[PDB]
Amino acid sequence: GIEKAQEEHEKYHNNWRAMAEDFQIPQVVAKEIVAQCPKCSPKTWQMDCTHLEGKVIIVAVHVASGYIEAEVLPAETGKETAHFLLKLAARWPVKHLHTDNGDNFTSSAVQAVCWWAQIEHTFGGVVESMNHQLKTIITQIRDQAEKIETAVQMAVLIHNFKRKGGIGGYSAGERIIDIIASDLQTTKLQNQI
Amino acid sequence: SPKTWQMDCTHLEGKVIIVAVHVASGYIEAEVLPAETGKETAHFLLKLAARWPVKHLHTDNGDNFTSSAVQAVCWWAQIEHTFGVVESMNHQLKTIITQIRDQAEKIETAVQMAVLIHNFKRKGGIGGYSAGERIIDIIASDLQTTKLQNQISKIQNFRVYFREGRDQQWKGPATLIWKGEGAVVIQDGQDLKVVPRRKCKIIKDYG
């Protein structure tokens, strides 16, 4: 397996995650294989903010499964963004946060919450598709509720558990639960063996 | 039961906190309410129903738990609502709140940090798991059972055109059972047989 991984990286220069999945090697050997080349994540969340009918809607998307979590913000300050990030860290395990070079995400309160929750905060074609799909669902079920908050939460529910599309035919919640369960069993068997 | 949630409310520092607990694994989601009306209670129940699969809810005979807005949200999300652990979780949450009070300025920061500490930083139990690992494992096992029972027929909904010994005509569309590495098991006219891999064509045959 190790010779197959070395020949595959010498031929096509694969990343360490695909080699660890396809050749069944622990991740430290694949990391050293990629690090020894001269030519050369289930817990990553991307954040964004948008506007809709004068309100500010903050959207956090889990990337490897397509999971959504949205909220209505009364303002675009830093304390409310830090509170939403604290609630997101208190609900799901967050290890790597991806954002844009903004003003509210670059704040002392949000950096204090990131330090207390031990999250790697990084600044930099999936999130635009997620926001566009959320906008189409919001325009679909707008007339079933009065305020925009109930419409946002019902759009989150429909996007999470009522859209069984894609190649596998799986919704977002079942995908993120199966991914984190398989990653937990993989880390357990690697810590045991 | 893997899909039963219970709810309760309490007071702290002049505020009103509402705590919802997944019972089978001890998973706490808590929020700070600015009022005790039915609108924000149904809004919190809608956020809980949008984040996690809630199929059965158990509450008490309160004033905000008996509301037409809560009935409308439960009808829209197809929730079986019953009237009647959470006190022990409230005691644990208040002790953690008093433990790390000195790092939070407001009250909601201390509440959400206590929720994070109780969810991911208190490893106990029998196997030595936290609460998030327990709820993820329970829901994954139940979904694996139901999806297995559907995927058997989903893989049996295919068609196989096979070839037999010393006959140059492709036979009819027998039903696939299992596709091995070098052998294919098919069912043809209530007769199970095994053909090699180089003598079969597997189509879904839209038409």
Added chain:
Amino acid sequence: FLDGIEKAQEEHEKYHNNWRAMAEDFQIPQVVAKEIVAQCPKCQSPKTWQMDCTHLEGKVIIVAVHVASGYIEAEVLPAETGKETAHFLLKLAARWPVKHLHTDNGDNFTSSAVQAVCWWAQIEHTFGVVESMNHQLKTIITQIRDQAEKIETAVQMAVLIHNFKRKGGIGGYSAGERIIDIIASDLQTTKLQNQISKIQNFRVYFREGRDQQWKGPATLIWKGEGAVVIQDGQDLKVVPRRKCKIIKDYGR
């Protein structure tokens, strides 16, 4: 059966699902589910390609990218005249189903040869992703340049590494699996639409219970072995076969 149809109608009224999810969950045939979807007033591309020309080490490379999945087919031209561009477009239209081409306002893209190729292959040509794919392809070309003697070998090996080795996206699939799944879904949609029209060219006279009279002409949806699904009064219902007369309808 009828309980499943009424549950699917209430579910589509609430949440506005698609027809595949309802046909898999509620155990109804796909023609009835597509009928329920098509009767919604609030519920109403896999064959588009982009072309580009670039320069690399004194040669002229031409890249054609399938947009909906990111599928790159590249070639090396001897010159930048119109005839070799028309020949590459004819090869691309011969291997993959192309129905809409998106190009820029170049000179060799505006020629009688490209116009005759688009006329013979029936392709809608539109003059205005690709820069990002060109950046990724040129980084891969500069990554594995030393393993090839000429430039065309490095170009084809970079196309292979980009198509079948680099994995990403939501589920972690490559580009070839995405284009094959998208085209297969389009094929399933076209076959089901042909079956829907061929069944919907009929008419049904139905007779209600405790009445010896025939009612109005309801449109047939799905003809089963014991049950018959009809549409009447903007409503779907299931009538048994012993109370129905299926006749041909000439109503163009």
Added chain:
Amino acid sequence: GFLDGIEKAQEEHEKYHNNWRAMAEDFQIPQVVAKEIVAQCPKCQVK
């Protein structure tokens, strides 16, 4: 072939409004295309 027969049947039904069996026996087209020619007329009705 009877493709010119189909064109002449369209012209003849546009003028005189024949029925389907008459055109199928005169112009020697099959009965399905003659019934479709009668079916496409908004004033006629196949009977």
